[PDB]
């Protein structure tokens, strides 16, 4: 038994992580066969990033102003283009410890495992929900940009973020491995707001059940609710909407507790009207959001990648 | 900016990581070199567990018993001994992806990663502290034994925990890796306590230092305390005596913010006797006690790994 917020096993990740400099800007590039991906406002300089036009600095560039180190081992730049929000380096060697992989974009509400590099080298590793407002709540600082957040199935790494800026409420913005940001955010240095965010419902509810599942039962009660019902109260406390579809996902939990979903979310109820009177639920004191029921499902089973 | 509760990147020692069988117990195995280091109560049955005697269970034992598994290849075992509560497995082959690395035992209050693993494979990775009591805080199911815990030091591996066991409340008791207890448990299938724990007065300063840096400031007074009076209000809600030593640690994040450690206290005093006020801290609504200086340093500076 326990909990915990658990990343995926980053060594697949780390063998792809590279450092990119150009000019006076250093970051980290992720070095998939004979490609490297990274940030295009690396081309920038300081005067640049204010308002650049990307097509007009690329086209000044020379595959030589590329330096990209992988380890203590420096790799030929011999192309290069712009791909949306991200730039391909074409190298003349491809990276043997390439894992098996996929670029997906994934959706708000969901998790990912994010392996915070710096200058190439991995710092740490830890778990991320993509929030409704399409940001992240990170641990970056400067020279993080180019760190990927990903998702391991099996033996396959499924990118599905690289990361940018931070915006001025200290949440962080980024694109998928395509290049396309997450949300209305630009690569540009200029004012921009995360706009409101909301909690995510459905993962409230997977929590609770991991709770009941690890032996915190006091926020049960006798009481059921509709989910029409309950939908009025998640509105108020500025909850997403619970959707069919998020009963039917949280299926085996509820089979397994034998609590029905509907039941969870009459205790779900009550905490948001009463909250939780000085106890704790998994050592937290607030309703936790980034667990997803497959987060749940995975560390209360033991599902391994090899 | 931001500040979340991140772990080592873990490549390094999901290279180590084996599937170690023999009769119908099946752990993890850490391989390094031509050794295999794991929990000696895999010689165990279910009828051996409840008060085993190890050293006759193990005379009882042949070289060709214990099946190793790393990857898809079997590792001939040629020898067999036992170190306090591990066993070495001398194995045919040398680890060609042996780190750098040292056995070290780690003081309470100490914080460290976990690759949880089940079958040799790795699961996923997350940061524990060692409690006071000398438990730690973890998710581990029915074959997670053998699990390691390390910190990792520019380029070199330092194991400090073998997972082995469960206790009654959910928390999870293990070894260094010269096979010595971390308290007063026992490999054996009997009723056993962890005894009262602790908060970690030194790690809820350092924490309280980070998001002073991050940017939470509404804790903050301009009252100021003795040490001794302090440790008054310490020893009440539970909390560990603070030392010279721990504030001389704090002196750095006392520097950066410009926040003396006293006053510091000061801050703290007044949150354990008012509590919070519906406020949050870095996103928690509890004190927390898992982050030690230099875990905030790491974070809020940025080190990194080679
Ligand atoms: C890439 O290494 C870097 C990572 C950020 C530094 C601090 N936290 C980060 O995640 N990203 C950047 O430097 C981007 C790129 C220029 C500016 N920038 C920023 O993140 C700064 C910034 C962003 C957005 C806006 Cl509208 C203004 C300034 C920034 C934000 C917050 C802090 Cl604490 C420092 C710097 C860029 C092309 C957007
Ligand atoms: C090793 O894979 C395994 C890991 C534990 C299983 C559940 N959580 C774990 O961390 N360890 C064990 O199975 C040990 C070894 C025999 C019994 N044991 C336990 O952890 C069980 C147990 C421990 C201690 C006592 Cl006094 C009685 C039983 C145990 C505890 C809790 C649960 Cl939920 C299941 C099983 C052993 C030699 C101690």
Chains 1, 2 share one sequence.
Not at 41 to 69: A, G, W
Not at 143 to 152: E, K, L, M
Not at 227 to 251: C, R, S, W
């Amino acid at each position: 038994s326990g909990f915990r917020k658990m990343a995926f096993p980053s060594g697949k990740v780390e063998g792809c992580m590279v450092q990119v400099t150009c000019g006076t800007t250093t970051l980290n590039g992720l070095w998939l066969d004979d490609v490297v991906y990274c940030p295009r406002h690396v081309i920038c300089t300081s005067e640049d990033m204010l308002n650049p036009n990307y097509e007009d600095l690329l086209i000044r560039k020379s595959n030589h102003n590329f330096l990209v180190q992988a380890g203590n081992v420096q790799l030929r730049v011999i192309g290069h283009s712009m791909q949306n929000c991200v730039l391909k380096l074409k190298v003349d060697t491809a990276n043997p410890k390439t894992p098996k992989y996929k670029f997906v974009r994934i959706q708000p509400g969901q998790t990912f495992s994010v392996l915070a590099c710096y200058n190439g080298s991995p710092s740490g590793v830890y778990q991320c929900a993509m929030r409704p407002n399409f940001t992240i709540k990170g641990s970056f600082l400067n020279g993080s940009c180019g760190s990927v957040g990903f998702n391991i199935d099996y033996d396959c790494v499924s990118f599905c973020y690289m990361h940018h800026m931070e915006l001025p409420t200290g949440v962080h913005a980024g694109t998928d491995l395509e290049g396309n940001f997450y949300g209305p955010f630009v690569d540009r240095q200029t004012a921009q707001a995360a706009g409101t965010d909301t909690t995510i419902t459905v993962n409230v509810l997977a929590w609770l059940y991991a709770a009941v599942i690890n032996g915190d039962r006091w926020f049960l009660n006798r009481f059921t609710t509709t989910l029409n019902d309950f939908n009025l109260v998640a509105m108020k406390y500025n909850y997403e909407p619970l959707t069919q579809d998020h009963v039917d996902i949280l299926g085996p939990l509820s089979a397994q507790t034998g609590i029905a979903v509907l039941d969870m979310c009459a205790s779900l109820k009550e905490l948001l009207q009463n909250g939780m009177n000085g106890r704790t639920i998994l050592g937290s004191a607030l309703l936790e959001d980034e667990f997803t029921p497959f987060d749940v499902v995975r560390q209360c089973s033991g599902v391994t990648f090899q």
